[PDB]
Design a protein around this ligand. Structure first.
Ligand SMILES: Nc1ncnc2c1ncn2[C@@H]1O[C@H](COP(=O)(O)OP(=O)(O)OP(=O)(O)O)[C@@H](O)[C@H]1O
Ligand SMILES: Nc1ncnc2c1ncn2[C@@H]1O[C@H](COP(=O)(O)OP(=O)(O)OP(=O)(O)O)[C@@H](O)[C@H]1O
Ligand SMILES: Nc1ncnc2c1ncn2[C@@H]1O[C@H](COP(=O)(O)OP(=O)(O)OP(=O)(O)O)[C@@H](O)[C@H]1O
Ligand SMILES: Nc1ncnc2c1ncn2[C@@H]1O[C@H](COP(=O)(O)OP(=O)(O)OP(=O)(O)O)[C@@H](O)[C@H]1O
Lengths: 578, 486
């Protein structure tokens, strides 16, 4: 005999429409058995639940069993397999036999792809035989049904493609347990928090809003993370307390973690009372930062410490970027009300080392959004079918988790191989790319940024609006801008700051014909010359006469360095015309 | 029944931040079981440890078990697999069943990619079934938990990409046991030396400083190497002693190793007392020279006997080179204090046979740093995707072990194919190179030196500061210089 379990039904939420459908299909045959028998009409036999792992498929099934109050027969993937070649089949028969005999019941087949995979992919004589046993059982149920037999077969799988087309046909009802929304996440948070004593400053609504691509399992973890964060106060208390009971002077310490461990080891049988504390909104934010979106395996490149203060000038470009990327992410309400669709992509083009790569990162940082950087040819393989599959995978990963900025550095390689017929591999990749951009998959949150040092040979098809339409030019030819850059670089030093010197340096003719990379080099060159002066002077004095070291940099060092250094980029005509 | 083991907790060091996090996550559920039960709140279930081989993953787990004092259940990669198709699954069940029954315990899954790899890469019906068994077990634990069941599942892997995305989702906490620093290495050295009687001339701080890309296992070996080097004195003593007891005249010798062997063979049952000697700093340096950086099977080329005395004149160039390369390697303190970022690269250009290749090696030697020399087109393949992957690999190898000088001889081939549209393969390679030089990551310690006999046709993009900005001209037209060379 197998009686039902006691699981909480108030734990699952965000599945309003799907749960309603399930209720309709399962309630009538199980609850009103006398009515169905009298009528003589036939009902639903098999219900298949699909979707990603940890979506609450197993829990939903368990919950449904407990709520209705029917007998639960759990059939896990390897629970029926035996030692000898015959025991496995005998068990399957016994399961179905006992199940039909006793009613009303719910048979749950958890993880079915391990038992019944495609019969062409299974070269074993046992696996094919097991699929056959299941089919036979299904038929027996159908025949027995008009008497008073009431059994519904529930099943859960992670992938529908791996299942044998034969069993798919046998199963009639299908429920898709996919991804949550803002409202749904809010509901899930409430379900988990239910047993906890939340403080008044906690707004679950705010948490849900600022939680993009997280699933039911992820939210569950965020709650657990908060619990651990709160109990850090108790750890500190115990540490101080321990160092008073058993001092051990300075013999127990070589480092910090090790000393803590040793004290606890000494105590052992010492029981301590823990006070029940409440959680803050700050603790939740800390917990959120330390959590993975379960899709960390993707290629999650973390956002650097680059802000707008690191970029000298380009104020016009900054505003334009804010409009396009920060506008839709931070203010979705504004965009929906006016009537326009959110952006797709921008192109950064111009001379080398002007801050194109920096800008991409800076924008990503500002938006507090995710960042992925694919440079030049980090996609291509030696095989005939992996490059295209990989590109498809990238977009799939991006679609799953949004907001994210997808950055493509140096597009001069992939794009020009269209206008002239050369390679076949290059042709396929670019065509797949065009398809991914414009085809059907561009449901926003994902903003594509492209950068190239050479805007010349590029296919107009990629440039077309909807793909990469916003062409932003990054160049450098003005005095005011140069002063800002010099200040920005010399800002990151730590007495003597000297502002007047910086302005004069900028005024010079040699400085006029420079770039961002050149100014950086000038700064480094000046530093090196200064070091030479410090070394020669200090060594002479110390040996003949130990004194102090002076890291100060004057104008004489700057002037000498300035005289020697020459520019990198010569002709700007190439970039501007083409 | 399976009781805990006695391993030293004072052996692992350099993992300050990570160990702290682990402590927070594991201490509360295991130690204060009564408190968690009363509250009703849920805790951490799975802790995954990742990083390279020999990083101390197995040791850390063993240490944690011993320190806490909980029951340790070691599950190695092939320990659960049986003969018949059913025994494997039955064992997995029994493991989880006994584990939940007895508490508090620590289940350790060592090398998990062998058990649960990607289900698409496994065409066997047994492997997929095993993954399913694990999943079922995980769920059972979660259900039983509110009663008084306290079990934490620890796991260790060498590669996260090989693991099935499904099990990755099941596991919640992840700790990265990566590469150590100067301070960290110092600490590791101290842990190993703990049982040895070190001399006063030994400065573990100096060893750590001059130990670039070595791991916890490598340092362990350096210590072992020193032990063998010291006991050479005892070997010499025994040899002299043996030749006096059993002379055998000149019949026992054809060569030197063979004669030594024969004498020892004759003795057999002769027990000798060994004096406990102390190790010197010189013995450590000798030991260090004979050790491999674990990544020996690489493009790692040894530094030749070329010094500044082999190069006639070019005193100005010598000084400039010293500033750029030796400055950051030997004096990091100076650079951090002043405020400038360490160098990236230099270009040696001019007439053939003027010492460009020599200079590169000479600098590497002087700095006592590593040297890799890639000449001309030793990168390109026949396939559409191995050339770019290889370049990426080179930079990855360089990043792992620093200080190193990366030398590119004859760049006149790769660089000019940008200004004029010719090939597609050449285009991809050069673009990847530009990316590796200027892009995301790529920290210092790695100084790139380029050399060319032809400075003419080269793309200005490569010349730009941050990539290969310091253009050094190597020529020869003066009398004084010639006398020095002669
Ligand atoms: N939608 C959800 N709402 C609330 N909690 C959830 C949800 N999904 C998962 N959880 C939490 O995560 C756990 C895992 O759920 P469950 O095992 O049912 O997922 P699953 O989709 O069946 O995973 P798998 O199919 O891989 O076994 C549950 O015990 C529950 O506490
Ligand atoms: N406006 C700027 N502010 C700060 N640093 C800059 C600026 N412009 C250029 N740089 C320096 O140049 C380097 C390259 O910047 P970035 O990669 O963004 O330029 P780019 O236009 O993409 O050209 P490339 O990557 O081809 O050199 C950076 O490491 C940075 O220090
Ligand atoms: N961080 C470290 N500190 C001190 N000793 C170490 C460290 N890492 C490794 N060792 C030494 O090397 C040995 C190997 O450690 P361990 O087997 O735990 O590494 P691992 O990363 O688990 O390797 P694998 O995962 O390939 O089994 C240890 O017994 C220890 O003596
Ligand atoms: N200043 C020098 N001192 C000693 N040997 C030199 C010097 N200049 C050239 N040589 C000799 O020339 C050979 C080549 O030197 P190196 O390869 O460094 O010159 P290069 O400028 O790289 O030109 P290439 O490699 O194209 O001949 C060496 O084997 C060396 O013996």
């Amino acid at each position: 005999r197998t009686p039902p379990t006691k699981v909480s039904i108030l734990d699952i939420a965000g599945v309003d429409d799907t749960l309603q459908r399930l209720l309709k299909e399962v309630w009538f045959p199980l609850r009103g058995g006398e009515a169905c028998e009298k009528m003589g009409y036939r009902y639903d036999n098999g219900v298949l639940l699909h979707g990603p792992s940890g979506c609450g498929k197993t829990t939903l099934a368990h919950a449904i069993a407990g709520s209705i109050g029917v007998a639960f027969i759990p059939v896990s993937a390897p629970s029926v397999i035996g030692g000898t070649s015959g025991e496995s089949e005998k068990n399957i028969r016994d399961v179905f036999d006992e199940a039909i005999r006793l009613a009303p019941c719910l048979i749950f087949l958890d993880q079915i792809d391990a038992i019944a995979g495609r019969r062409e992919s299974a070269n074993k004589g046992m696996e094919s035989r097991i699929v056959a046993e299941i089919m036979n059982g299904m038929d027996r149920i159908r025949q027995n049904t008009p008497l008073g037999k009431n059994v519904v077969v529930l099943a859960a799988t992670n992938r529908p493609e791996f299942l044998d087309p034969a069993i798919r046909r046998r199963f009639s009802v299908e429920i898709d347990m996919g991804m949550p929304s803002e409202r749904a996440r809010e509901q899930i948070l409430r379900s988990l928090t239910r047993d906890l004593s939340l403080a008044d400053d906690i707004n679950f609504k705010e948490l849900a809003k600022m939680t993009p691509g997280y699933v039911g399992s992820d939210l569950q973890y965020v709650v657990k993370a908060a619990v651990s964060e709160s109990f850090q106060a108790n750890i500190d208390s115990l540490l101080a307390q321990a160092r008073a009971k058993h001092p051990a002077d300075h013999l127990a310490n070589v480092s910090q973690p090790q000393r803590d461990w040793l004290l606890l080891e000494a105590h052992r049988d010492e029981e301590v009372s823990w006070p029940s504390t409440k959680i803050t909104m700050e603790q939740f934010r800390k917990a959120v930062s330390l959590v993975q979106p379960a899709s960390k395996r993707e290629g999650f490149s973390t956002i650097p410490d680059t802000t707008w203060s690191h970029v000298g000038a380009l104020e016009d470009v900054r505003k334009k970027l804010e409009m396009s990327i920060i506008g839709p992410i931070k203010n979705p309400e504004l965009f929906t009300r006016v009537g326009i669709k959110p952006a797709a992509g921008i192109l950064l083009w111009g001379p080398p080392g002007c801050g194109k790569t920096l800008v991409a990162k800076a924008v990503a940082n500002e938006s507090k959004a995710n960042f992925i950087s694919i440079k030049g040819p980090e996609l291509l393989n030696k095989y005939v079918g992996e490059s295209e599959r990989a590109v498809r995978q990238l977009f799939s990963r991006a679609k799953s988790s949004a907001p994210c900025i997808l950055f493509f550095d140096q597009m001069d390689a992939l794009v020009p191989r269209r206008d002239d017929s050369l390679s076949d591999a290059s042709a396929r990749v670019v065509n797949t790319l065009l398809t991914e951009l414009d085809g059907v998959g561009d449901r926003s949150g994902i903003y594509v940024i492209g950068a190239t040092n050479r805007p010349d040979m590029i296919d107009e098809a990629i440039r077309r609006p909807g793909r990469l339409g916003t062409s932003i030019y990054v160049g450098l030819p003005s005095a005011e801008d140069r002063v800002k850059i010099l200040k920005t670089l010399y800002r990151n030093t730590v007495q003597g700051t000297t502002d007047a010197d910086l302005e004069k340096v900028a005024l010079d003719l040699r400085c006029t014909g420079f770039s961002g990379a050149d100014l950086g080099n000038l700064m480094q060159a000046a530093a090196q010359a200064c070091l030479e002066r410090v070394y020669t002077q200090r060594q002479q004095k110390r040996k003949e006469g130990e004194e102090e070291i002076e890291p100060v940099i004057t104008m004489e060092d700057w002037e000498k360095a300035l005289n020697e250094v020459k520019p990198s980029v010569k002709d700007p005509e190439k970039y501007m015309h083409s």
